[PDB]
Write an enzyme that holds these catalytic residues in place. Sequence first.
Site, PDB file in Angstrom:
ATOM      1  CG  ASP A 133      -1.818   1.219   1.218  1.00  0.00           C
ATOM      2  OD1 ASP A 133      -2.615   1.373   0.286  1.00  0.00           O
ATOM      3  OD2 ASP A 133      -1.644   2.034   2.148  1.00  0.00           O
ATOM      4  CD  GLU A 170      -2.048   2.478  -3.528  1.00  0.00           C
ATOM      5  OE1 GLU A 170      -1.463   2.672  -2.479  1.00  0.00           O
ATOM      6  OE2 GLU A 170      -3.235   2.807  -3.701  1.00  0.00           O
TER       7      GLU A 170
HETATM    8 CL    CL Z   1      -4.224  -1.351  -5.915  1.00  0.00          CL
END
Ligand code: CL
Length: 496
Positions: free
Chosen positions: A197, A233
């Site tokens: 993330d 990401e």
């Molecule tokens: Cl994603």
Amino acid sequence: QYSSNTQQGRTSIVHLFEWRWVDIALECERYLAPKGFGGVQVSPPNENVAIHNPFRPWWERYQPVSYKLCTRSGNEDEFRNMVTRCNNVGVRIYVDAVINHMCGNAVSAGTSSTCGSYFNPGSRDFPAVPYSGWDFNDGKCKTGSGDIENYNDATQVRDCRLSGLLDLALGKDYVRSKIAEYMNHLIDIGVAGFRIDASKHMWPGDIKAILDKLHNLNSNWFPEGSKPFIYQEVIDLGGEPIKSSDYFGNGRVTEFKYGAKLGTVIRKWNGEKMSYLKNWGEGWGFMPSDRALVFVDNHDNQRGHGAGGASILTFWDARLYKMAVGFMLAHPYGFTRVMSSYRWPRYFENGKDVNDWVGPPNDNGVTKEVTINPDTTCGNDWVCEHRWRQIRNMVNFRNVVDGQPFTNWYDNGSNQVAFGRGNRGFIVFNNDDWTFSLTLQTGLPAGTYCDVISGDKINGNCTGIKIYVSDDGKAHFSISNSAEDPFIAIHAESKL
Ligand SMILES: [Cl-]
Ligand SMILES: [Ca+2]
């Protein structure tokens, strides 16, 4: 870190957004395994802040409180049960790892956490880890607000707080260590990899220092020396100092340009057309196929968040959505991830959806179980796009044509295109305002093939459209622009 670790012949992962561990375990056994899915991306399994205003939003899961496996999805026992059961049927698990930050710096101290852990954001106190003020970037950030203010400055992007979320000092070995601790626990349980993330908000080097400390995959299911699959990401739509390529040494990277452009093409925006897809992939400024993680939509951007804004296609746009997902699963570019959502009371207070915060279907905060309808769809407001016949069948299409070249391309110079994948599959699309009716050269051996869009192959017969390929490999296709599903797909395994 670039290999998915999925079984041979399983080429996609599905994001079961906010699903309970117990439901995922069942799903692995009753659907994912037998219908050819390769793996599941799960929501953050670590303890987070329980936000009561607004009421338990989906995004509360991106505000960690500790690394205890206790969330609305379940406890550690349930998590362990899930990983074991999925792995036993050949379906892998990928964890959404929230490691850039802890919770909002203005959240209130106490035990309003999913597991009752005490935390004090004001003092930077996370006793359950533990983390103290010496573990945050407060001193490293140089902004007047201590928050990210300008994306032209690579340093603030990474050392300042993303919208006020306490930024962990990933530069310290202690912090890197605590994280690796957490990640190793998961690996030993049986997880095949991670979604990292907010990678854009971390230095490629810090991420590297963390991966250095990880174990190889669990030798009960994975050959010795296997490395966890890593996908980061990084929102990169260009024109920023920070580039997705900066993260290639750590693993794959989310290619957000893919869904933005697929969305524009299918919606026929900015004078874009399907015939332009003939050079889809790098040809459009994308990252190398061997480093891309592609998707039509994600949890953020299906809400007009992420990147792509208004162009992103979602389950709300069902007809076009199926077409976009279909195109993605048939095209050779990247490693594909399918989205599986929940319905929310979308309400535009002119311009913006003021309910884009709403969490999963629940009863006073308790996530509702996934019920199955008689038509194999889901109830309790779970959308289950992965169970839509057209999507499920295209997941299998991808498995069947994996590794085949992109061939037999056809286009009418507008929005009627077709292409084959070696001698194993052929797909036809009609996104124009008139009927498509033409005999095409398919590259497929002669026989009767079931269209897997309008129906299924059920030992000996087709329940939908039948395509007859002549020995010269030609077939006639007729698709009305008014069809529910204006596309046809046939493959080696849909052949009678
Ligand atoms: Cl994603
Ligand atoms: Ca950071």
